[PDB]
A = this chain, B = another copy of it.
Amino acid sequence: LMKVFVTRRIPAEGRVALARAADCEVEQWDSDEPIPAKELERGVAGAHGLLCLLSDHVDKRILDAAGANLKVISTMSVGIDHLALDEIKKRGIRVGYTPDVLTDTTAELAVSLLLTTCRRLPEAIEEVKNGGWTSWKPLWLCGYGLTQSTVGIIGLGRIGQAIARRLKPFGVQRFLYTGRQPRPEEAAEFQAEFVSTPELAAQSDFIVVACSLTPATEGLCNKDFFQKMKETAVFINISRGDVVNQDDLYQALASGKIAAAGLDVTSPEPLPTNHPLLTLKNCVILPHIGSATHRTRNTMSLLAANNLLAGLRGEPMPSEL
């Protein structure tokens, strides 16, 4: 049998999958808890195929443990910045991600985070609980909305368009998407104006980060960027914690460079419970649940399950990289 290792308990749709792949030798870490690198290396042994998660770091440390056998690696993620694309492609090992299936759920959560943040829902929830609520109050819990607002999007990819699309009907008068390269064909639907970062941080009432993580994106959102933003603007990120400089972001929210932030990703993950960002009543922190819907998660897992079997068997993958 062709040996395969799975990094954690994945959705049934896929577990039942590889299970039925008689031509395969599948070992599984039966936990929801991430596997310690030490146990990970002890697991990729003799494996011909690796089925990991965005949390799993597939670096030279793993390609080594794996060995010549390592021919395929399937991740239940769309991202790719957690993989050693060089060490990988070098050893001619095929890779695979889960694009498109999470594009509509992710953009959905991003808009949920944006609204939950600018409409101060969290604060509102705690006040009903702690007794601060006494009556309808006209100057109470007011936030900034999307009417005639200007939305700035960083890295307008699949989700990025899916975010702009769900926002356009909220009253947005103008969409601006910053990025390394223009996508005039992907901006037309929204009449979005491709812009540089300076004018973006300065022209947006809302800023949403939905870009891949490369050396050019790391620390891309810092003090200078935050200082240039409107102190009434809201900052949202659903990409990777490293595109943002958290220490600058925190000081910005404490002083008042911007009005609030909504983060679905941090550095590191899980953000420590005593971390400064969690002491601010104007910073929303989700535990990275961008693609968290049953249908999506199940599809993603099956895709990864099949990108694994298709891969291993040598044939083409349903979603190769």
By a beta-carbon cutoff of 8 Å, the part of chain A in contact with chain B is 8-11, 32-34, 53-55, 76, 104-105, 108-109, 111-113, 115-116, 119-122, 124-125, 127-131, 133-147, 165-166, 168-171, 269-271, 273, 278, 284-289, 292-297, 300-301
Contacts and interface: CB of A to CB of B under 8 A. Distances in A.
B130 A273 contact: yes
Contact of A115 (B8, B115, B133): B115
Contacts of A131: 273
B55 A125 contact: no
A287 B133 contact: yes
A146 B166 CA distance: 11
Contacts of A122: 121-122, 125
A53 B112 contact: no
Contacts of A55: 135-136
A31 to B, nearest CB: 10
Contacts of A33: 134-135
Copies of the protein in its oligomer: 2
Given A116-B115, A121-B112, A142 B273 contact: no
Contact of A53 (B8, B138, B147): B138
B136 A269 contact: yes
A136 B108 CA distance: 18
A116 to B, nearest CB: 5
A46 B103 CA distance: 62
Given A112-B115, A112-B116, A115-B108, A11 B138 contact: yes
Contacts of A76: 138
A129 B273 contact: yes
A116 B121 contact: yes
A287 B141 contact: yes
A144 B294 contact: yes
B138 A300 contact: yes
For the complex of A and B, list the 10 residue pairs with the smallest distance between their C-beta atoms, beginning with the closest: A112-B115, A34-B135, A133-B270, A133-B287, A54-B136, A145-B293, A142-B292, A55-B135, A166-B169, A55-B136
